[PDB]
Amino acid sequence: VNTALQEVLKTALIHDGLARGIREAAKALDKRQAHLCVLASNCDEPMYVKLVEALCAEHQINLIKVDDNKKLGEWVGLCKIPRKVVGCSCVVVKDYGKESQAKDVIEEYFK
């Protein structure tokens, strides 16, 4: 179910909890402070970015996958609702709020 991206990300932007972007993801992985990693599977061909795929096998990070760039850019960050299209490709969530329905679905996804 997709409330593992609806109930954590929209409640996570309000708390200085997003590290959105790609080089900031590399500096956040070297901080050892990645707790939640939303990848991309949308690319020109996906073999061009292998750094966030391999630095978690050095750094023991949880990974949750998605297949989309534009619905990723509609999950997190800003947009007009002639429309301001930006697209996000990798998300490090650094911090959270206090949640009682959605701690587990980001927590227990270790398969």
Partner: protein
């Protein structure tokens, strides 16, 4: 003539040029306000990190 303005220069996807794939491709900046991912640019007779404005050699 005229004095030109400065445009932000565009290197294209240098985000993998901070690493070499495990093994980084440039050297680290020692700092307390920086660190945990902050490297120094290795020029031909000098080595440069932005925030501390540090030159090496």
């Amino acid at each position: 003539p005229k004095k030109n303005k400065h445009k932000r220069k565009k290197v294209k996807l240098a985000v993998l040029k901070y690493y070499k794939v495990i093994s980084r491709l440039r050297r680290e900046c020692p700092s307390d306000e920086c660190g945990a991912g902050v490297f120094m640019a290795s020029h031909f007779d000098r080595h440069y990190c932005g925030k501390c404005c540090l030159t090496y050699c």
